Amino acid sequence: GRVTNQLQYLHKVVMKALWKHQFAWPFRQPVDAVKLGLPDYHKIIKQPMDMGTIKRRLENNYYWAASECMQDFNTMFTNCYIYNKPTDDIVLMAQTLEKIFLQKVASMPQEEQELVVTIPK
Numbered sequence: 735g736r737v738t739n740q741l742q743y744l745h746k747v748v749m750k751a752l753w754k755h756q757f758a759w760p761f762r763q764p765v766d767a768v769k770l771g772l773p774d775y776h777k778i779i780k781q782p783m784d785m786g787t788i789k790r791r792l793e794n795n796y797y798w799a800a801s802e803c804m805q806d807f808n809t810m811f812t813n814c815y816i817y818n819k820p821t822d823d824i825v826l827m828a829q830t831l832e833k834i835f836l837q838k839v840a841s842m843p844q845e846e847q848e849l850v851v852t853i854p855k
């Protein structure tokens with residue numbers, strides 16, 4: 735992957751705010767369907783995603799484009815809405831985190847630019 739202004743923003747602004755939020759803990763590592771006794775979790779949720787995975791990917795320059803990281807956040811949130819029941823608190827927690835995600839994304843740099851300057855030519 736690479737380091738861009740938008741990915742750096744997703745790491746140092748967006749993930750920094752979401753990771754430390756009071757509602758973050760169920761999303762900080764993959765859903766552990768075995769420990770949770772949920773044999774249908776991986777039958778219903780075909781692309782699991784969580785903030786621990788996204789954070790490690792940002793730390794390791796896994797992404798080539800901010801849009802890929804944004805889609806991972808979206809998948810994490812949508813997985814939660816799809817698997818759980820409308821009135822569960824976890825849905826409200828996902829919704830609260832997603833609102834912050836969108837609020838912070840609104841101030842992301844407009845043009846995706848590489849931050850690593852290379853020798854000209």
Ligand SMILES: CCOC(=O)Nc1cc(-c2ccc(C)c(NS(C)(=O)=O)c2)nn2c(C)nnc12
Pocket residue numbers: 759760761762763764765766767770772813814817818824
């Ligand atoms: C009622 C049946 O539905 C569910 O249990 N739903 C979900 C449950 C939990 C969940 C609970 C308890 C614990 C201890 C954990 N820890 S973890 C991240 O290691 O697996 C997670 N996360 N979750 C996420 C995200 N999305 N849905 C759920």
